[PDB]
Amino acid sequence: SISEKMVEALNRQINAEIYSAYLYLSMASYFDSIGLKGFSNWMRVQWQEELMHAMKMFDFVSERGGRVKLYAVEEPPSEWDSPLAAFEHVYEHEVNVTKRIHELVEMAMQEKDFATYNFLQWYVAEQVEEEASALDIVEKLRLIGEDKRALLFLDKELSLRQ
Amino acid sequence: SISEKMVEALNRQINAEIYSAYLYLSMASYFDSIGLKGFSNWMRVQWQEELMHAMKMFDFVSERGGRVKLYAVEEPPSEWDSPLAAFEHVYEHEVNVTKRIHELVEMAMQEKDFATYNFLQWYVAEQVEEEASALDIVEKLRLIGEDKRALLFLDKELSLRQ
Amino acid sequence: SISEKMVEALNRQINAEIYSAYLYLSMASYFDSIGLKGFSNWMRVQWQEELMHAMKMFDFVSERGGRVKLYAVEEPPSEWDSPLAAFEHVYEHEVNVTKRIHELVEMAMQEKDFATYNFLQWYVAEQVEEEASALDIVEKLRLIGEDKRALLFLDKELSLRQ
Amino acid sequence: SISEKMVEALNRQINAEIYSAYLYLSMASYFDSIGLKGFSNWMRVQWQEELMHAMKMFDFVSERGGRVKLYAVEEPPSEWDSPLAAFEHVYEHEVNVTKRIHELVEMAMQEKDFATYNFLQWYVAEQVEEEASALDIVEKLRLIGEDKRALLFLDKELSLRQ
Amino acid sequence: SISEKMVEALNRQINAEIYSAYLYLSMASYFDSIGLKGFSNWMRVQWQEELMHAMKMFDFVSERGGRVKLYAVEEPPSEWDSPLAAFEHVYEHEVNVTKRIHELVEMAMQEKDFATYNFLQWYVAEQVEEEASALDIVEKLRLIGEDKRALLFLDKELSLRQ
Amino acid sequence: SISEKMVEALNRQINAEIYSAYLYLSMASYFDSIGLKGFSNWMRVQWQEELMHAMKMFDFVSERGGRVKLYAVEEPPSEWDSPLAAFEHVYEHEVNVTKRIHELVEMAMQEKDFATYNFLQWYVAEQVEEEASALDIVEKLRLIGEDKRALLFLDKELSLRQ
Ligand SMILES: [Fe+3]
Ligand SMILES: [Fe+3]
Ligand SMILES: [Fe+3]
Ligand SMILES: [Fe+3]
Ligand SMILES: [Fe+3]
Ligand SMILES: [Fe+3]
Ligand SMILES: [Fe+3]
Ligand SMILES: [Fe+3]
Ligand SMILES: [Fe+3]
Ligand SMILES: [Fe+3]
Ligand SMILES: [Fe+3]
Ligand SMILES: [Fe+3]
Ligand SMILES: [Fe+3]
Ligand SMILES: [Fe+3]
Ligand SMILES: [Fe+3]
Ligand SMILES: [Fe+3]
Ligand SMILES: [Fe+3]
Ligand SMILES: [Fe+3]
Predict the structure, then answer these.
(1) What does the entry list as the binding residues for Zn(2+) 1 (chains A, B, C, D, E, F) (predicted)?
(2) For burial by CB atoms within 10 Å, which of C114, D91, D108, F27 has the most?
(3) Which chain F residue's Cα is nearest to B149?
(4) What are phi and psi for residue B80, nearest 5 degrees?
């Protein structure tokens, strides 16, 4: 039932979820390098979260009788201009992930593959949260601007994530 | 104090630990594809293990004052002639990972980087277990030869790993 | 079989550890003098911790069959230009302690005194943390420069240390 | 990959650990014979402890891919002029086991067998304790001299070891 | 009052109990050599159990005021054709150990040494179990023959012993 | 992965399991017709049980992503010479159902279809029980013979089945 075309694409998106993890891990290294252990922590938590996103899709492809094929994970970028620019890139990347999910929804429907549609609804809801979390911190870094105490305050708040 | 040479090698090995995890994840797919869910499980656990291995080094490079550069993760192989060949590939890959850790140990000696030498001793000990665990299962699968009832028994046991 | 050369190098290091403690107690007074009770708390904790490093080495010297000679503890300096300057001194000092530790490690290697070589690996690993904890505060102090509200945020953080 | 000459050496040291136990068990019969039930206890405990030392190495030869050959265990001596002489024998014995372990460490270094080098570090630190425990009791027994009431106070203390 | 002839005879039977331990230890190696870590476990446990047998009798000789002499433990054998042959050697060995204990019993009665007779009744019952446990596994392995799965099923049964 | 071959074979076994049900329901009517309400109840319970056997296969064919086709269920026979003759038909019939299952097992193993092999193992075990149960009552009736209080005794006993 699950079509070979639907598998390939889910396999794409599995790779996109892993590269996001890996992107966030590179950011963990960047925030590490500029003293911000709380931001670093957030990123490490996001890395593991995106890996979990990938695995939940890895397991669904196998369950449905599809075959997971893993592809290369690209070398991510490694520097950003500022914590603000880091999170702005998070936001934009997550909006891109949200696009690619909306398309998998659309493909599922064309193929009348109701199981893959229903499953992707998890990721549709999850992307709403991803974008909003990312936006919310972007807004906070914009008011903070150059104010070093506010920056360190946000960094503590972020160190608390699990 | 940590040299650039040494930071490079460690960043490389971090990439290799992540690759190892990714190979084992591939094998988990292979094993799903021939209905050995226990072998699959064993791999899925070893994938989490190797990622953890990677992170302990990722954190160490940054504590030593160096900077983690992340590199592409190679697309891994996707098929194996049999369960025996896949664990034969496992054992061998592990013997190589060991060789890599031994070369890192020697570099640390050459450079008198006592901190990195001591740190690496954990991997010296871990690679002993890695090899032995893989070899034991290669042996089991040799003893089992062609008997598919015995394969499923070993499969159910491997499904018990957490 | 522990040599005289070794027993004296270890006794001198016992003195260096106790002086490191004492130095950090002098910095505690300095930080009290300028209203930074959290910086003061950090130094106090570090003072107990360094005393604890000396005591582990004290016990070991006798465990090996040696005798601890105690030497004078030098009057430490009592003024620094700034928090940043004081923590730059902590860092350069701990880099020097490391350098002494590594000397002992070499001396023990050179003497085939394996028991002492092994005992000191704990100090090899401890010094990694010691340099990192201090460099992290130096860097935060740099990031902060003259902003006194941020300095006070950081003082509060250090008042948490146990 | 462990060499033959390293396996054989380890297996000789397994034998020596077992002999050590057996020597200390003979000593327990000695002490029973002169009514000193605490010195007896101390030895029975150390006979178990040396067996544990042997089994730890027995397991490691197997976990490296080697195979353990077991050897005759020589008939230990059965008499000593006095409690002081028995514990002197214990001391000179343990200093000799330490020598044996140190030779093992050297061999491992020469062959670049880092895995064995690292495993043996446990026996390097254990021998530090073994020498000091036996030495303290030797020194106590010298302090004590021919006083029989004091000897029995020591005997009672030694009966508390578990 | 226990006699000299009895004390020697119990002293030899200890030796025999320690040898049996050592024999079983040798088999543990042999089963470890051929992949059967569950059989190996059984053998480690029997190795401990026979040491407990020896010590119980070591203590009894003491309790009666005899002196335990310790003799060389003999180098054991180290290969067997198969799991079956090994357990046949176990049973035959244990049947022989029964014979020795039935001889100590008849000696005891001859000397009217009731306290040694009563003491030996524990070993008389224990041997009934020793024989019956060995024979049960011989019987099971014959029925098993060359069937690999069934072999592995029993090796897991044996991994359970404590 | 599950073959067309294996699916049609399972669907056919499903038919066989529903027919078994219906055969047992037809006997419940027989036993009802001759005043044996306990035998009837036994059949009604066995009818629900074989329906459950069916549905577990229906669900399994469908989980593995194959399509259950439903075939006609044959008119079963409706009379028997006696309770004994009736339970002899149950036995023969169950021995036949065992034949079919063992055939489904070998086909699975041919196609190396290990999920299906493992799933059928429940039925192999279940059939061992079916046969033993039927056989046992067959035997209890050979004994009862013409004896009427013992037939009513057996009849109460089968009332009890839930
Ligand atoms: Fe995601
Ligand atoms: Fe995301
Ligand atoms: Fe999320
Ligand atoms: Fe690893
Ligand atoms: Fe590994
Ligand atoms: Fe491991
Ligand atoms: Fe220190
Ligand atoms: Fe320090
Ligand atoms: Fe510290
Ligand atoms: Fe020892
Ligand atoms: Fe010792
Ligand atoms: Fe000890
Ligand atoms: Fe025994
Ligand atoms: Fe026995
Ligand atoms: Fe027993
Ligand atoms: Fe059925
Ligand atoms: Fe049935
Ligand atoms: Fe049933």
Answers:
(1) 17, 50, 53
(2) F27
(3) F109
(4) -140, 145
Measured CA distances, C17 to A35, C70, C131 (Å) = 28, 12, 15
Which chains have 3 or more CB–CB distances shorter than 8 Å to chain D? B, C, E
Distance of alpha carbon E139 from alpha carbon E151, whole angstroms: 13
Phi and psi for A73 in degrees, rounded to 5? Answer: -100, 115
End-to-end alpha carbon distance in chain C:
40
Is C21 within 8 Å of C54 (Cβ atoms)? yes
Size of interface A-B (CB pairs under 8 A): 49
* Distance (Å, whole) CA F21 – CA F27: 10
- Residue F146 phi/psi, 5-degree rounding, is -95, -5
Distance separating alpha carbons of residues E25 and E46, to the nearest angstrom: 8
CA angle (B35 as vertex; B34, B40 as ends), nearest 5 = 95
CA-wise closest residue to E44 among D45, D54, D23: D54
**Distance from the alpha carbon of residue D26 to the mean position of ligand 11, in angstroms:** 15
Q: Which two tokens stand for residue D32?
A: 């029973």
D130 is in an annotated binding site: yes
* Residue A76 Cα distances to A12, A73, B70, C87, D153, angstroms: 17, 9, 7, 35, 71
For this experimental structure, what is the resolution in angstroms?
2.7
d(CA E40, CA A126): 51
CB D68 within 8 A of CB D108: no
One-letter amino acid of C153: F
Across the interface, do E72 and D73 touch by the CB < 8 Å criterion? yes
- Tally DSSP H helices, then E strands, for chain D: 6, 0
Domain boundaries, chain E: 1-162
* Cβ atoms of C88 and C33 closer than 8 Å: no
The DSSP line for F63-123 is HTT--PPPP--PPPP---S-HHHHHHHHHHHHHHHHHHHHHHHHHHHHTT-HHHHHHHHHH
The tokens describing D71, both together, are: 């050897």
The rounded Cα E113 to chain-centroid distance in angstroms is 25
Contact E107, E6 (CB under 8 A): yes
CA distance, residue B38 to nearest chain F CA (Å): 11
User: Which chains sit next to E, with 3 or more Cβ pairs under 8 A?
Assistant: B, D
- The beta strands (E) that lie in C10-150 are given as none
Write down the residue that tokens 């054992």 correspond to. Answer: B91
CB B21, CB B54: distance < 8 Å:
yes
Spatial separation of the C-alpha atoms in residues F156 and A159, rounded to whole Å:
71
Measured CA distances, F44 to B7, B9, C31, F137, F162 (Å): 75, 73, 88, 16, 9
d(C-alpha E124, C-alpha A113), whole Å: 73
Spatial contact of A49 and A13, defined as CB atoms under 8 Å apart: no
- For F54, left (φ over 0), alpha (ψ -120 to 50), or beta? alpha
CATH number given to F1-162: 1.20.1260.10
> Could you identify the residue written with the tokens 């590179």?
A26
d(CA A108, CA A121): 11
Non-local (6+) Cβ contacts of A139 within 8 A are none
d(CA B89, CA B4): 32
> Distance from D68 to chain E by nearest Cα, in Å?
6
